[PDB]
């Protein structure tokens, strides 16, 4: 004779998707205003096997949506460059022809007066028209609205910790060689993820986490995470020492450009150590053999400028100092949106960055799966029912 007994506090959970909030120790500091745990706790769950799937992880989709929303809200209250889209009279500034000095007739704050203004554009920002070869328009002029980023709003990525709402928990896979799918036999429970840097790139993954033991290749040879021996530190620079200029295109709407360049014009570039890259490629091939314009270049945000580097000296080898030229682009469609673009105004002085290569994409959300692959969100269900011999009075 068994009776129903209700137990509250049962250590069980089920898969669930909920809204996660972010915390951090600038758009990211403003958005992720919740402070982090100064000494985060983690509980190892012994004798627990949990199935993970990094390609069905809704934390990646939420991270993506939060990034798109934050970029849209950050650029929304900023100057829209619609007074432009006029024929430009461009003369070469110089490698020669990469930067042009373009003049144009723009209506200023007063609607009765036209002014002849000058601005500096990169070859990638303008499209030639007519047969004069000095008549140009902005590359995205007739298809999109180009919004100038506010000069006081920084998009520099900082570590972001994703935290579950109370009542939910994040399970972490502690198998250092886990391939991103299937059962994990060393599972721990955390409230917040590690610090994830929302870095945006197209080929090489810069900054972020590193594999604890060896290079791990995850697919289904697609996403490669570099072992404890960090891959090449990549030193990228824009040597052209610029002086920022500002003109007005309407009441309260200032357009920023480059007024002059001090010294000689030089090409932007990135320096990758040759021996370390050769060792990285060798180790990647060893692991691969166990199983057997904007989309052909390495894009990244360096100092606030958008670099497009020619990654052809890195992936031109056959198996069993490397200076990559880079172009700088100002008018971009960062998220491939229809009808929208950002102008990303130029920064004066010179720019130098030093980034850590942590992984590779061979053959977007894939830039972040490489960080969130070890986490899943579950819902806690503390109410359980089981038979006992005890009966209520």
């Amino acid at each position: 004779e068994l009776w129903v007994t209700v137990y509250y506090g049962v250590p069980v959970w089920k898969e669930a998707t909920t809204t996660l909030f972010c915390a951090s120790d600038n758009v990211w500091a403003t958005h992720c205003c919740v402070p982090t745990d100064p000494s985060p706790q983690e509980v190892v769950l012994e004798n627990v096997t949990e199935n993970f799937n990094m390609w069905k992880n809704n934390m990646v989709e939420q991270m993506h949506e939060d990034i798109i929303s934050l970029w849209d809200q950050s650029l929304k209250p900023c100057v829209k460059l619609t007074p432009l889209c006029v024929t430009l009279n461009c003369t070469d500034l110089g490698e020669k022809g990469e930067i042009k000095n373009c003049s144009f007739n723009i209506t200023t704050s007063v609607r009765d007066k036209m002014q002849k203004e000058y601005a500096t554009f990169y070859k990638l920002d303008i499209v030639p028209i007519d047969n004069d070869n000095n008549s140009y328009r902005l590359i995205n002029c007739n298809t999109s609205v180009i919004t100038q980023a506010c000069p006081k709003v920084s998009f520099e990525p900082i570590p972001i910790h994703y935290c579950a709402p109370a009542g939910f928990a994040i399970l972490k896979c502690n198998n250092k060689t886990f391939n991103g799918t299937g059962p994990c036999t060393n599972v721990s429970t955390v409230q917040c993820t590690h610090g994830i840097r929302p870095v945006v790139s197209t080929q090489l993954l810069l900054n972020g986490s590193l594999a604890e033991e060896e290079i791990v290749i995850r697919s289904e040879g697609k996403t490669i995470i570099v072992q404890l021996n960090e891959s090449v530190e990549i030193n990228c620079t824009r040597p052209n020492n610029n002086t920022r200029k500002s003109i007005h295109i309407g009441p309260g709407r200032a357009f920023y450009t480059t007024g002059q360049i001090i010294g000689n014009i030089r090409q932007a570039h990135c320096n990758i150590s040759r021996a370390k890259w050769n060792n990285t490629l060798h180790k990647i091939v060893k692991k691969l053999r166990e199983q057997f314009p904007e989309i052909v270049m390495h894009s990244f945000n360096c100092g606030g400028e958008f670099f497009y580097c020619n990654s052809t000296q890195l992936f031109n080898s056959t198996w069993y100092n490397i200076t990559l030229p880079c172009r700088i682009k100002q008018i971009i469609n960062l998220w491939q949106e229809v009808g929208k673009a950002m102008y990303a105004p130029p920064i004066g002085g010179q720019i130098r960055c030093s980034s850590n290569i942590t992984g590779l994409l061979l053959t977007m959300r894939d830039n972040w799966r490489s960080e969130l692959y070890k986490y899943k969100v579950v819902k806690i269900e503390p109410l359980g029912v089981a038979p006992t011999k005890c009966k209520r009075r």
Binding site: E1, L2, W3, V4, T5, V6, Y7, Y8, G9, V10, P11, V12, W13, K14, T18, T19, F21, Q41, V43, V44, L45, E46, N47, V48, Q73, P165, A166, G167, A169, T189, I380, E381, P382, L383, G384, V385, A386, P387, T388, K389, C390, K391, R392
Partner: protein, 120 residues
Amino acid sequence: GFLGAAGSTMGAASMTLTVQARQLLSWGIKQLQARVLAVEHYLKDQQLLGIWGCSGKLICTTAVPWNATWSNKTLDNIWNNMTWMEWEKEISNYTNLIYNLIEESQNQQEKNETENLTLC
């Protein structure tokens, strides 16, 4: 720690940490939704414990008999050699039926207490 005994047998859990962790309270739409949902989950669990006569307890004994249809295993193989995950997830899909029976029993008990003047 929290869920530390999740891999232990059902009779070995003896946990209070997982309810302490449930004392949820110790642009702006997403935070309001998260806070409202946390409140709703707290209140729903408290409501269920209330209507079952289980408020304030972690182990609540009821007067509903166990039906072998739901599970025909003996206690020797339920509280030992099995975890709470396996019990609740793989061999228990009668949760709503059992809850309804618990609620009916609690309501019958309270009405019986009101009707029987020897308790009044």
